[PDB]
Write a protein that binds this DNA or RNA. Structure first.
Lengths: 108, 51, 52, 150, 139, 126
RNA sequence: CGGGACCGAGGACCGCGCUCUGCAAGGAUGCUGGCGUAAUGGUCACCAGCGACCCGUCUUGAAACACGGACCAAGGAGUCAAGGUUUUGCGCGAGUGUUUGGGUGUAAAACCCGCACGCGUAAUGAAAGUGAACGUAGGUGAGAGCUUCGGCGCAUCAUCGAC
RNA sequence: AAAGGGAAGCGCUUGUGACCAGACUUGCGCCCGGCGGAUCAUCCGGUGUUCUCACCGGUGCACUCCGCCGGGCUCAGGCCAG
């Protein structure tokens, strides 16, 4: 608004390689760390799993459905077996999933 | 329990019926938010002018 | 007045906001026993006598 | 004339909020009364932080609260004069009693589901008028993009 | 709750429809405002307990707020007309303003307003004629 | 009625602050303007020149906006406007607005006489 | 112990005191006279004493020079848009953004809806690619606040470590 | 209407002349006397309230209340002064 400006107060006093035809869809691989892995489970089922009322079932998480292609390994996991389906996985993320007692399945 | 509100008839007298007061009537009264939104909203029907 | 609750239930992405104040009665809060029982004694009055 | 090599300094701190929130004004009146009529430094700190702007009130998360709840602080009342946010990386919320300026919906739900209590600052003034058995927490002030670019 | 007299005062302290702001003072048109001045003490519509006095045909008419009927405006006012001796009116007004703890800070203003209305209801005296002065006015 | 007892009304300066050179130029109004020229004698406060207004000339807080009788003026447009001064007849006087008709002026003056409120311009339109 | 000048801020009581029936002790009262109106007071015009260069503008350090101004009325010059950045207020918050569009309407308003998308939630490398816990998310020294008075220690700073 | 012996204009302060705004005109309170009326106190019933305070109807039978008019007295009242 013009009535709040300073002019009204001052009235009276004045490298590397080139890549031709880059297609960004070739390089689409969003990543999620394992410390956010349980947030993809729906809230009621996640609280049941974390409380321990599901001792005979394991959650199967499809990262590509949630929009992720790579499972990275920042954080720690609870001691619950989880099946994770991913296009890519880091070595530490696989190591932590295996310690948690699940398995990383490769998909395309 | 939640408060009630009396229902009045066409003659202006209570009908004997009550209604539960909706939860929106207990919302915070925020004149700064109201003034900001009203200042924005009252400009949205303006027609442009130019020389 | 019956439909207002369903109207505000049907607004997705919005919940009725929580206030930063639970009790709006400032006089009740200030003159409650819980606050008044721990206060210091008054250090003066509303009007001060001129000393010199 | 009087030779004044030194200069009298006007105040460089907030004496009142810039906000027009009426409930914040009522809270400021209550804590002005408390800071005047009590010896507790907690009330003066709370009043001064109620005066503060938003970048001077960074959010505090449930994982930060859970970190500060360790080592004998499990039964203390946590006082935050900012927004308490939820951290989905924290899978198990401990039982806690938190008084904050405001809560996010998920933070309030997770505290009440873990069995703790959520209070406002006027409820905190009612229950602990001298700030006894409180744990005063601040969020990370320098964790801002502008501060990184400074 | 979300509503209180303090909250209503914060909402309406800078502007309301009863406000009359001029250079020499800020007045209020509120019917429940003794002394007709804009302040939280005298803001009768803001306050939970409040008193107002209006002239009757003879005597005064005092309205007081009922605290249990704040959401029923048609039955929210306790109204008494005093058409009797001025001392009896002052005694009854001070009784409803101070005896049961209903706005004891307003009893002086209420008695003064009743006195002003009863004084205004007297016959007016004829003014002395204007004395012409000087040269041009006198001649 | 007579005004409330007050301290004597002291005016530090009764003369107006005339604008520099407005006595010599008719396109210049006498309303005060601060001279902003770097070599201006009034701005530099050379002696024998026009005074400049400042906060040191301010009136006593107890007698500010008081007319010589001791009342403060309150502008009124009707009978309901003049009835706001019911509790303030010793401190406030009523000034009837310039665009009020003669009949409404008569009504305002009658009501103010009943209330004991001084009217500053009661003789007009008579 | 005299003689004179200027001033009287405050407005129940509270205090320090004293020469203590009271007082000169946290600020003026008492008595009296004339007048009650242009008498006091004010505005305008003029005389008198003293005081007092013509305004911007430019230049440099400054003056001087130079340039503009016969007079009056009316216009008459730091604005809008896009994109940044810091600060203030507000909403929600690991998310956030209804308004390209669709639905709806009392029809350019208001209300409602959602897929995608933008920004944020992860970085590093020219790239292929790889990708963030030894530890109550570490140790030490400060540090508001709290404390069961032993300590716990926010933000933040310094330093040594870990990924 | 006024001023003017080679400029006027302006500032501080009187004075003269002309022209004006206020303020004031009496208020409140006691003691007598004369009127005109009973919305004096108490009690009873009804109603409303802030639940002990009020309003309305009956009772006043005039050493009680309320106005008015004559006197007297105290206090406070405008301007300049000693």
């Amino acid at each position: 608004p013009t009535r709040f400006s300073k002019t009204r107060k001052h009235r009276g006093h004045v490298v590397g390689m080139r890549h031709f035809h880059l297609l960004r869809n070739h390089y689409w691989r969003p990543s999620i760390n394992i410390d956010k892995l349980w947030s993809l489970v729906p809230s009621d089922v996640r609280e049941q799993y974390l409380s321990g009322q599901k001792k005979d079932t394991a959650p199967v998480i499809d990262l590509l459905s949630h929009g992720y292609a790579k499972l990275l390994g920042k954080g720690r996991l609870p001691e619950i077996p989880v099946v994770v389906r991913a296009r890519y996985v880091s070595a530490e993320a696989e190591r932590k999933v295996k310690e948690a007692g699940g398995v990383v399945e490769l998909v395309a | 329990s939640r408060p009630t509100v009396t229902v009045f008839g066409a003659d202006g007298k209570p009908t004997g019926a009550t209604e539960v007061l909706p939860k929106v009537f207990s919302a915070p009264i925020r004149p700064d938010i109201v003034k900001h939104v009203h200042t924005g909203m009252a400009k949205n029907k303006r027609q442009p002018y130019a020389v | 007045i019956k439909q207002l609750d369903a109207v505000y239930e049907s607004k997705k992405g919005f919940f009725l906001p929580a206030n930063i104040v639970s009790q709006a009665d400032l006089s009740r809060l200030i003159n409650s026993t819980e606050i008044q029982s721990v206060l210091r004694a008054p250090k003066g009055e509303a009007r001060t006598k001129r000393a010199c | 004339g009087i030779d004044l090599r030194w200069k009298h300094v006007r105040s460089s701190h907030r004496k009142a909020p810039k906000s027009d929130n009426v409930y914040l004004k009522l809270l400021v009146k209550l804590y002005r009364f408390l800071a005047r009529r009590t010896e507790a430094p907690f009330n003066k700190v709370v009043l001064r932080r109620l005066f503060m702007s938003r970048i001077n009130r960074p959010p505090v998360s449930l994982s930060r609260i859970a970190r500060n709840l360790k080592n004998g602080n499990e039964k203390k009342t946590v006082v935050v004069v900012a927004t308490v946010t939820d951290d989905n990386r924290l899978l198990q919320v401990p039982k806690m009693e938190v008084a904050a300026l405001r809560f996010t919906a998920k933070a309030r739900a997770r505290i009440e589901a873990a069995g703790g209590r959520t209070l406002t600052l006027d409820q905190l003034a009612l229950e602990k008028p001298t700030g006894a058995n409180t744990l005063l927490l601040r969020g990370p002030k320098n964790a801002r993009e502008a501060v990184k670019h400074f | 709750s979300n509503v209180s007299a303090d909250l209503i005062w914060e909402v309406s302290r800078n502007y309301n429809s009863f406000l009359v702001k001029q250079r020499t003072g800020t007045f209020s048109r509120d019917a429940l405002n003794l002394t007709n001045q804009h302040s939280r003490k005298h803001a009768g519509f803001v306050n939970d307990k409040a008193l107002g006095i209006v002239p009757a045909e003879k005597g005064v008419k005092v309205i007081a707020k009922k605290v249990k009927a704040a959401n029923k405006p048609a039955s929210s006012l306790y109204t008494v007309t005093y058409k009797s001796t001025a001392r009896k009116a002052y005694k009854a007004i001070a009784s409803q303003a101070a005896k049961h703890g209903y706005r004891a800070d307003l009893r002086q203003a209420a008695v003064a307003r009743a006195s002003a209305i009863l004084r205004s209801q007297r016959p007016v005296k004829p003014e002395p004629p204007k004395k012409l002065r000087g040269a041009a006015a006198r001649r | 009625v007579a005004a409330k007892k007050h301290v004597p009304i002291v005016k530090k300066r009764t003369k107006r602050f005339m604008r520099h050179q407005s006595d010599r130029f008719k396109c210049l109004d006498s309303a005060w303007r601060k001279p902003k020229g770097i070599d201006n004698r009034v701005r530099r406060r050379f002696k024998g020149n026009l005074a400049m207004p400042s906060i040191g000339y301010g009136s006593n807080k107890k007698t500010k906006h008081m007319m010589p009788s001791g009342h403060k003026a309150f502008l009124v447009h009707n009978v309901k406007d003049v009835e706001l001064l019911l509790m303030h007849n010793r401190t406030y006087a009523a000034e009837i607005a310039h665009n009020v008709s003669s009949r409404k002026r008569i009504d305002i003056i009658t009501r103010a006489k009943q209330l004991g409120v001084k009217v500053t311009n009661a003789k007009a339109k008579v």
